[PDB]
Amino acid sequence: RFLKVKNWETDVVLTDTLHLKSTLETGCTEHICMGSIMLPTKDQLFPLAKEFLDQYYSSIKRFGSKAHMDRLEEVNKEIESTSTYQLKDTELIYGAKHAWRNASRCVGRIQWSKLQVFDARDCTTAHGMFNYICNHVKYATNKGNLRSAITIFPQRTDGKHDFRVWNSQLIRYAGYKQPDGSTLGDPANVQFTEICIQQGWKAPRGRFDVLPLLLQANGNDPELFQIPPELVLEVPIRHPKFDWFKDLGLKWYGLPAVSNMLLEIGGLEFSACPFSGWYMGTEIGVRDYCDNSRYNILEEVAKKMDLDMRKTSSLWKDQALVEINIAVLYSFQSDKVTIVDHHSATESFIKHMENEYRCRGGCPADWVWIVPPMSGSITPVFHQEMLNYRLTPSFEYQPDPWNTHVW
Amino acid sequence: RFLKVKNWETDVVLTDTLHLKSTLETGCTEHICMGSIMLPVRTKDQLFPLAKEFLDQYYSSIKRFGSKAHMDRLEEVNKEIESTSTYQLKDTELIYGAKHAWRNASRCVGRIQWSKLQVFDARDCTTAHGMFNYICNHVKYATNKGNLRSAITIFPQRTDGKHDFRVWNSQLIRYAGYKQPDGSTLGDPANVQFTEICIQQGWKAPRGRFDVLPLLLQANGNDPELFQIPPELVLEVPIRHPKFDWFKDLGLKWYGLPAVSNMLLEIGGLEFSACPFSGWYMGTEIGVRDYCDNSRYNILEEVAKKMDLDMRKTSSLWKDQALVEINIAVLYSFQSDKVTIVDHHSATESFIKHMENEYRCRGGCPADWVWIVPPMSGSITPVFHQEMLNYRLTPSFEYQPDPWNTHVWKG
Ligand code: HEM
Ligand code: HEM
Ligand SMILES: Cc1cc(N)nc(CCc2cncc([C@H](CN)Cc3cc(C)cc(N)n3)c2)c1
Ligand SMILES: Cc1cc(N)nc(CCc2cncc([C@H](CN)Cc3cc(C)cc(N)n3)c2)c1
Ligand SMILES: C[C@H](O)[C@H](O)[C@H]1CNc2nc(N)[nH]c(=O)c2N1
Ligand SMILES: C[C@H](O)[C@H](O)[C@H]1CNc2nc(N)[nH]c(=O)c2N1
Ligand SMILES: [Zn+2]
Questions:
Q1: Is B77 helix (H, G, I), strand (E, B) or coil?
Q2: What angle separates helix A66-82 from helix A42-59, to the nearest 10 degrees?
Q3: Which of B254, B260, B289, B290 to mutate to test the pocket of ligand 4 (most atoms within 8 A of CB)?
C-alpha cells in the first residue's frame, strides 16, 4: 500500500502514496508484467465528475466549501437533465495541465504547469479547426522560442459526432511506396499519405513533404487543409565538424505536436486535442533518423565516416549514432530553435520527480519510455526506480480514425 | 488464454501460451506496474506439489510422462519427503533443473546458450575448504584459457535454514574497493562493504585499484572462511584502444569471467543457496556499467579529457562519445587476447532468434525488457523494438539478501 522507490546511483529512497489514488488498469497482473507492451452513460459519469471536481476544489484550497458543494450540485443537475456537462474554463485549464502532469511516458513534465490552453470548444466546422490549429502552430513555434500549448476541440457527445485530427502529429512528412520496392520519405506515414491522395491531395512526391491536415468536425467526413508553409519552421541538419553532413540533405521540423490522442477530464472525452512542446534531440537523431523502419540513415552516415562496417564489434553503428545526434542538436541550437539534450532532460526529470514526491506523494513514470534510446545508463533516469500507474485527467491512445469512420 | 507480443520494427506478432504455467508473483497488479523495481524453511505440505510439478516437467521433457519410471519416481520422492521432510535430486534431474533455471531467467540476454551448461555437482561438499576446491576447479574449467565455457557448481541444498551453504562474494571474481578518509574511493566502490568485511576477517589488503578479492565461504551454516583464488587461475585483460595509443595509460584492466555467486537456485521446491554460475561477458557490462556508472569506476571525464572533447555543455554529447570509444576498447582488448566476449549487437540479435525459437517450440519466452535492452545504444538493437512478457517460471534463479545481514555468528 505504501511503496518505496530507490535510486541505485544515489541511494535516495522515495515513498509513493499517490498510487492509491490510481483509477485505470495497467495491463499487468500478479502473474504477468506488460511493462513493455506499447498498447496494453449517466451512471458512469457522475462518479468521474465528482472525483475530478473534488481534486480541483482541493487544489484551490476550497475543499468542502459552499462553492465546492454548489458546483457538484450544478454538475449533478446538468448530467441528470442533459446526460453530460460542461467544464468551466478554470476546470478545463486545470484538467489539461494535469493530464500532462499524469502522462507517465513524458520526460518533459517539469514544465507541466506552464501550458498555454486554447479553448476551441466553440468550433463547429473543419475550416474552424484548421484556423485554430494554424494559430496553435504559430503560437507554440514563436519564431523558434517554443512554448507548450494544447488546443481543445468540442467533447464527445453520442460518439457519432466526434472531432478528430486524422494526422498522428500536426506536422509530419509523407511516405510513398515506390515501384523500386523501396520507400521514399517517412515509412511511418505511408498509409496516411495514401488516404490523403485518395481524398484528393496532390503529393509533391519528395523526401520531406509536410503532410496536409485531415480534419473531422462533428463526426463529418474529414476534409483536407495545407498548413501555411511559412508557419512550419524546419531545420536543415549539419554537423559542427563534418562538412559532408549537410550533403545528406537532412531536415526535421521544430514543432513536435501530438494530434491523435484523447484527453479525458472529469469523465468528459476530448477526442481532438492537439498538444505540443519542444524536442529532445534523441527523438529525431536516434529514432526518426536511425530506426530501421524510419529514415534508416546509419549505413549512409557510417560510410561517409569511413568506418569499418565489416563487423558489428567495431561499434560503427554506435559511433555514427552519436554523430547524427551531435548534428541534430547543433543544427537546432544554431538556428535558435528550442531543443533539449537527453542529459539535461533526464536531469530535469529527476528533479521533477523529487518535487512531485515531496509535494504530491509520487509521480507515475514509465521507465521503458523515460530512459532515452541511446546512452541509457549514463542518464540518471536509468538508475531510478519508477512506479507506473494511471491517474486522471489523462491522455489516452485512440485508434486511427480510418478504422472507426463510416464515410 | 493467448497473449500476443508485437515487434514494432518487423510487425512480427508472436503468441504466448507458456505464461499459463507461471505461478510466483511479479510485483505488479492491475493498478501498478513494478517492471523497473530491482527487487519487487519449507513445510512438507508445500513441498510435494512443487516436487511433482518439476518431476512431471522433467518426465515430459524426456518423453516418459506417465511411464512406470515416472510413477515410481513420484512415489519414491513422496515417501522420502514424508519420511525425511525433504528429498534428493537424481543427477539427471539436477542437470535438467539447472539448465531450466537459466532458460527461465528473464533478465538474461545470453539464453540462446542455455542447453550448453556444464553442471558440477558439489552436493557431497562439507567444508569451506571443500567449497574453495570446487570453486577453483569451476574457475579453471570455465576460463579454459580464454575460450570460456558456461558452468555452474551446485553446493548442498538448504535443510533447516540454519545450515546454509553460502558464497558471501556476490561474484567469484571482483575487485576490492577502499573508502578513503578524504571521502574518495580507491578501486571499485560497489565492493567497499564486502572489502571491509574481508579485511575485518583478516585479509591483507594490497590497497590498489584492481585487487582481486578473496573468497569468503560458508559451509553448513558455519562462520565463513577466507581463501585467496590462485592468481594464475584469474584471467585478466589489459584494456587498450585500437586507435588511441594513450588508452593503455589509463591503467585499466578487467577480469574475463563473470560468475554470479549470491543467487539461489530453486529446483522442484528445493533451495540451493550456493550455486555459483558463469558465462562470458557482453562488452557493455564492463565498458558502460563497470567503467562509466557514476557509482563505479566513473572514467568518462578522464577519457573525454584525453580525447579533448568539448566538456563545457552536455549537448556536445561528450559523454556519449567517450562512452562509445571505451566500449570499442573493451571489445578490441578481449578479442586481441582471445578471451570470449560478445558485442551488444550480436548478443541482442541472437536473443531475438532465441526468443522466436522458444515461442515456436515452447509457447513463450519470459523476458524482462528493462534488463534485456543494453545500457547504451538501446534503440539501434532489435530488442528495444520487441514487446516482451515478463513472468516467473521454475526452476529459477532468485535474489537473496547478503549473508552478513542474516548470519548468526558462532565466533
Ligand atoms: C515541453 C517539452 C516537452 C518535452 C521535452 C517532452 C518530452 C517527451 C518525450 C521525449 C516523449 C517521448 C516521445 C516519444 O518517444 O515518441 C514524450 C511523450 C509524451 N509527452 Fe511529452 N514532452 C514535452 C511536452 C509535452 C506536453 C506539452 C504534453 C501535453 C500537454 C506532453 C505529453 C506527452 C505524452 C502524452 C507523451 C506520450 C506520447 C505517446 O504515447 O506517443 N508532453 N514527452
Ligand atoms: C553464456 C554467456 C552469457 C551472456 C552473454 C549473458 C548475458 C547476460 C547479461 C548481460 C546479463 C545482465 C548482467 C547485468 O546487468 O548485471 C545477464 C543476467 C543474467 N544471466 Fe546471463 N548471460 C550468459 C550466461 C548465463 C549463465 C551461464 C547463467 C546461469 C546459468 C545466466 C543467468 C543469468 C541471470 C540469473 C541473470 C540475472 C542476474 C541478476 O539478477 O543479478 N546467464 N546475462
Ligand atoms: C508533445 C511532445 C513533445 C516531444 N518532445 N515529443 C513528442 C513525440 C510525439 C511522438 C512522435 N512520434 C511517435 C510517437 C509515438 C511513438 N514513439 C506514437 C505512438 C505509437 C503507438 C503505437 C503508441 C503510442 N502511445 N504512441 C510520439 C511529443
Ligand atoms: C552469468 C553472467 C554472465 C554475464 N554475461 N554477466 C553476468 C553479470 C553478473 C552481474 C554483475 N554485476 C552486477 C550484477 C547485478 C546487477 N547488474 C547484481 C544485482 C543487484 C541487485 C540489487 C539485484 C539483482 N538481481 N542483481 C550482475 C553474469
Ligand atoms: C516494445 C517497446 O515497448 C517499444 O519499442 C518502446 C520502447 N521505449 C520507447 N520509449 C519512447 N520514449 N518511445 C518509444 O516509442 C518507445 N518504444
Ligand atoms: C532502476 C532500474 O530498474 C535499474 O537501474 C536497472 C535497469 N536495467 C538494468 N539492466 C541490466 N542488464 N542490469 C542492471 O543492473 C539494470 N539496472
Ligand atoms: Zn508490470
A1: helix
A2: 160
A3: B260
Q: Which amino acid is at A288?
A: D
CA distance B149 to B141: 7
Active site residue B280: yes
Enumerate the domain spans of chain A: 16-121+148-158+262-276+346-370, 122-147+162-233+397-401, 234-256+279-344
CB–CB of A38 and B387 under 8 A? yes
**Integer Cα distance of A34 and A142 in angstroms:** 40
Q: What is the DSSP string of B341-396?
A: EE-HHHHHHHHHHHHHHHHHHHS-----HHHHS-SSSGGGSGGGGB---B---SSE
Among all residues of chain A, which has the CA nearest to that of B285? A377
- Report how this structure was experimentally obtained: X-ray
The answer to whether B108 is a known catalytic residue is: yes
CA distance B6 to A134: 36
Distances (CA, A) of A102 to A99, A127, A140, A278: 5, 32, 21, 18
Assigned CATH topology for domain A234-256+279-344: 3.90.1230
Residue A354 phi, psi (nearest 5): -60, -40
Which CATH code, of 3.30.300.20, 3.30.930.10, 3.90.340.10, 3.40.50.10490, is assigned to B16-123+150-160+264-278+348-372? 3.90.340.10
Topology given in CATH for the domain delimited by B124-149+164-235+399-403: Nitric Oxide Synthase;Heme Domain; Chain A, domain 2 (3.90.440)
* Cβ contact, residue pair B317, A298, below 8 Å: no
- Ligand 1 pocket: which of A94, A106, A276, A379 to mutate (most atoms <8 Å of CB)? A106
Q: Catalytic one among A71, A91, A101, A106?
A: A106
Is A369 annotated to bind a ligand? Reply is yes
DSSP bridge partners of B212: B175
Correct CATH for A16-121+148-158+262-276+346-370 of 3.40.50.300, 3.90.340.10, 3.40.50.12710, 3.40.50.620: 3.90.340.10
Q: How close, in Å, is residue A27 to chain B by CA atoms?
A: 6
Give the list of residues 6+ apart from residue B313 with CB closer than 8 angstroms, or none.
none
Residue type, A311: K
Nearest CA residue ID for atom 15, ligand 6: B371
Determine if ligand 4 sits within 6 Å of the CB of residue B285: yes
CATH 3.90.440.10 fits A122-147+162-233+397-401, yes or no: yes
Q: Resolution in angstroms, to 1 decimal, for this deposition?
A: 1.9
The answer, yes or no, to whether any atom of ligand 2 lies below 6 A from the CB of B143, is no
Q: Is B1 on the interface with A (CB under 8 A)?
A: no
Cα B148 from Cα A5, distance rounded (Å): 37
Contact A219, A160 (CB under 8 A): yes
Smallest Cα–Cα separation from B250: which of B324, B289, B301?
B301
d(CA B25, CA A31) in angstroms, rounded, equals 5
What are A33's strand-pairing partners?
B390
Concatenating the DSSP letter of every residue in B33-72 gives B-TT-S-----HHHHHHHHHHHHHHHHHHTT-TTSHHHHH
Phi then psi dihedrals of residue A100, to 5 deg: -65, -50
B80 counts as catalytic: no
Q: Is B36 annotated as a binding residue?
A: yes
| Residue-wise DSSP of A222-238 | PEEEPPPGGGS-EEE--
Establish if B336 touches chain A: CB-CB under 8 angstroms: no
Distance CA A264, CA A396 (A): 8
